[PDB]
């Protein structure tokens, strides 16, 4: 029956192609989100005073947030993971065109230029991907040939017998004379015009030797990561410190994850002078320091302006020169290992003070030879030789809340969130990943140990308990809702009485100038009626517990949204893998939960993300903030897989659990993030499931938002895939959104907003829309 009965009997297979999703939050129908929040929350909260996390990204030893989350929560990459990690690590490159005649579109290998199917990526690369990702042996290539097994340092010797004469230029011989004095002899060679130098007995000299240093492993950004891959040009790469690349790439990635592909689109809604850069570091460009300090000393070729690239706040500068071109607040904090948490807190306040309505917050810190050495002398980093004697492979050398923990695995990179006013987030229809319920920092006590972890942050649970006979009605939200209704009635009366008064004044005004006067005063009465409503809403909705010592700031933050103290499902511990910190953290949490009156047997689940990523110092709290947000949106709590045996000392802490494998919950309502930097830097930050927010808005508003996000998620997803294939996710602005002439006009006008220029197509400031009556 021929091969025709068997070719029609054969079935065509379909092979799956990577479809890397941005993973925006899943928006429920209004009916469902209205059930989870209490019904009395509607129009209770001022949404200007609510801070939401509206987009997050990181550049870490596991690539982006999406791959790092994949590896943290599932311990392996799916197709979409393997492609993204292969593309990040420059194993694969996209190629549209002709290849050996026939026209090919899709991935190719970066080296061979062989076409690679998506199915075949996991077979071909997922070995090499996992072999050059995360915590592994320090790879010299990545750190200017630094090999911690053979660490160069120079030693002075006093020469005991004169050297062979060596030729040098006149200026060089001169500088040898000025250094060594009589201990050197310089003699011009007539014909050539060059000198002959001869160091004499008693002259200094410096001989290079090697030291075999013992911290051989580190949390390194994957081998083959390259800023060009995102679309940063060589001029930027050459000028700036590598840290500045991380930040820049993290910031464009965060913006994309916020749906905002063009940063100027912010200026359709806000004044240039409200887009804040409240994001800091630990030691800034240490590569540029190591230049000016040690490469200059050896007189190596080093860019003349290497100083400017080493300052903590230079990274915030470059982002704002290349991407944002704002005149918003720029508060760069320094908080050693808790910077990321300080930068949230500053941001939060920077929006609640009103000086800004959007901060770029988060941390970022490089790993370099100088650092890795000084931390090893301090004995804070885990001695890799000792670990090898204990049979620890590199992966498993960061193992928080473990018996056998000795010290932290250092790592590098950046994390960036974008926080906003909820009101403005809904108005722009950006995705909301979380609510920043509180952020706080504290100092511990007098003491003569800088790196000492301490229990200052405990003061987030501070409250009074001497008069708890009867329930405080100030927590009973219904009471609060009543009082807000009582106020908005007075507001009503006030607006009527002011509209009367206006009419009365305007009657005596001449008829020609009447219109102008009424417009100007009707705006100001609308302004004051808003101001009074938001002040009420702020008094009852948000700031009900600021002036009440019987409510803790930690209880206060949850109680804003109707949540009890029991709801705080997850605490994301600092969890460095060092003997003092992990015990001090646990005790502190445990004592906060115990004081506030967490129900017995309702522990917080501990997340120790640093077991995978290691400790990026400045950026630690910005990764835990990303690890929170993705938990809050997945309801999945990743296990500390390196928690082989939880430390018997931590059993005494009743309100703490130490999972060793991923728990796929039915929901997480809130997540604590605690960090303890060097120098008594203690920070805490509470993030709440964004769904609670939607309780506070009407059905119509919600649905209008949902539409605008759905559109802005599609447009993001388009921009993300177009940027990724052709390496143009990064596109530095060439010009500000205003010509040099209008700068003054744009800054002075509070209500200047960018409009699409039809000719160019891009967003710019229009001279019509500056000091405009409309």
């Amino acid at each position: 029956n021929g091969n025709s009965a068997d070719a029609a009997y054969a079935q065509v297979e379909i092979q799956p192609r990577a479809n890397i999703q941005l993973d925006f939050p899943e928006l429920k129908p209004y009916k469902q989100v209205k059930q989870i929040a209490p019904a009395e929350l509607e129009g209770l909260l001022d949404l200007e005073r609510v801070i939401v996390v509206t987009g997050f990204a990181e550049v870490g030893p596991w690539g982006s947030a999406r791959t790092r989350w994949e590896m943290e929560a599932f311990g392996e990459f799916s197709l979409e993971g393997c492609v993204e990690m292969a593309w990040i690590m420059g194993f694969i490159s996209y190629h549209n065109g002709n290849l050996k005649g026939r026209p090919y579109t899709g991935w190719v290998d970066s080296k061979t230029k062989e076409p690679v199917d998506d199915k075949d990526v996991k077979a071909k690369y997922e070995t090499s991907i996992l072999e050059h990702s995360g915590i592994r042996l320090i790879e010299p290539e990545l750190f200017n040939g630094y090999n911690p097994e053979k660490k160069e340092m120079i030693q002075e010797v006093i020469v005991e017998e004169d050297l062979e004469p060596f030729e040098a230029s006149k200026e060089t011989a001169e500088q040898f004379k000025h250094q060594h004095g009589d201990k050197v002899d310089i003699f011009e060679i007539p014909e050539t015009g060059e000198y002959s130098v001869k160091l004499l007995k008693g002259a200094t000299l410096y001989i290079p030797k090697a030291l075999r240093f013992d911290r051989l492993v580190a949390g390194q950004i994957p081998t083959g990561w390259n800023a060009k891959t995102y679309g940063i040009s060589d001029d930027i790469i050459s000028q700036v410190d590598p840290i500045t690349l991380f930040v820049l790439v993290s910031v464009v990635e965060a913006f994309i994850a916020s749906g905002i592909t063009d940063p100027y689109e912010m200026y359709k809604y806000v004044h240039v002078s409200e887009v804040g850069n409240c994001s800091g570091s630990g030691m800034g460009g240490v590569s540029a320091l190591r230049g000016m300090f040690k490469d200059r000393f050896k007189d190596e070729p080093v860019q003349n302006d290497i100083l400017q690239e080493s300052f903590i706040n230079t990274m915030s500068a470059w982002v704002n020169m290349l991407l944002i071109s704002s005149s918003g607040p720029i508060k760069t904090p320094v908080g050693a290992c808790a910077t990321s948490v300080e930068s949230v807190d500053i941001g939060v306040e920077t929006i609640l003070s009103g000086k800004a309505r959007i901060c770029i917050v988060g941390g970022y810190d490089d790993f370099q030879e100088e650092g890795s050495f000084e931390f090893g002398n301090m004995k804070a980093t885990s001695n890799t030789l000792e670990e090898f004697e204990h049979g620890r492979t590199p992966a498993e050398m960061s193992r928080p809340a473990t018996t056998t923990r000795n010290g932290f695995m250092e790592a590098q990179g950046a994390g960036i969130q974008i926080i906003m006013q909820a009101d403005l987030a809904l108005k722009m229809g950006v995705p909301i990943y979380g609510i920043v319920a509180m952020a706080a920092t504290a100092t511990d006590k007098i003491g003569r140990s800088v790196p000492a972890p301490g229990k200052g942050i405990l003061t987030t649970a501070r409250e009074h308990h001497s008069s708890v006979k009867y329930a405080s009605p100030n927590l009973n939200m219904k009471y609060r809702k009543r009082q807000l209704v009582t106020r908005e009635a007075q507001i009503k009366d006030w607006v009527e009485n002011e509209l009367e008064a206006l009419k009365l004044e305007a009657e005596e005004i001449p008829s020609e100038d009447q219109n102008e006067f009424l417009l100007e005063r009707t705006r100001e009465i609308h302004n004051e009626a808003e101001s009074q409503l938001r002040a009420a809403q702020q008094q009852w909705g948000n700031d009900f517990y600021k002036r009440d010592p019987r409510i803790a700031p930690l209880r206060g933050a949850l109680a804003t949204y109707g949540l009890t103290i029991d709801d705080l499902g997850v605490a994301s511990f600092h969890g460095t893998s060092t003997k003092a910190n992990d015990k001090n953290e646990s005790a502190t949490i445990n004592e906060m939960m115990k004081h506030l009156g967490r129900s017995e047997g309702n522990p917080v689940i501990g997340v120790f993300q640093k077991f995978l990523t290691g400790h990026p110092k400045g950026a630690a709290g910005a990764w835990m903030m990303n690890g929170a947000l993705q938990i809050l949106n997945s309801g999945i709590i990743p296990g500390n897989r390196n928690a082989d045996n939880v430390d018997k000392i931590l059993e005494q802490f009743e309100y703490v659990l130490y999972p060793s494998k991923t728990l796929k919950t039915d929901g997480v309502r809130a997540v604590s993030i605690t960090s303890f930097g060097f120098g008594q830097k203690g920070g805490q930050a509470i993030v709440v499931h964004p769904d609670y927010l939607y309780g506070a808005i009407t059905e119509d508003r919600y649905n209008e938002y949902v539409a605008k996000v759905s559109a802005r998620e599609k447009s993001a997803y388009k921009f993300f895939h177009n940027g990724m294939i052709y390496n143009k996710l990064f596109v530095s602005k060439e010009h500000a959104p205003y010509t040099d002439e209008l700068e003054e006009d744009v800054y002075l006008d509070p209500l200047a907003r960018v409009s699409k220029d039809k000719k160019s197509g891009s967003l710019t400031f229009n001279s019509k829309n500056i000091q405009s009556k409309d």
Partner: protein, 96 residues
């Protein structure tokens, strides 16, 4: 073949059952809810054994709380977990 493999520093300890019990109960609870385990699974009895064997006060308080706060009106799977819990609480208190 006669290479020295043994070293005392390579000795690994696992002793912290006290924690693992609470994790191993919480994995059950959410597996029952997400209906990965039914009411006809010998795994539900296996788990129940392995929890009981690690009964203490803290574990009984950790169950009592999680099971008592289950919302039986959210689904069928919630009624299943709430019954099983209540029974497994009574077990652990007996074999403590």
């Amino acid at each position: 073949g006669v290479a020295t493999s043994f070293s005392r520093k390579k000795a690994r300890t696992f002793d912290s059952s006290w924690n693992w019990a609470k994790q191993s109960l919480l994995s059950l609870y959410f597996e029952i809810i997400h209906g990965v385990l039914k009411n006809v699974d010998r795994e539900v009895v296996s788990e129940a054994i392995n929890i009981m064997n690690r009964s203490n006060d803290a574990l009984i308080k950790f169950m009592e709380y999680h099971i008592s706060n289950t919302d039986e009106t959210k689904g069928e799977n919630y009624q299943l977990v709430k019954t099983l819990g209540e029974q497994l609480i009574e077990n652990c208190k007996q074999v403590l």
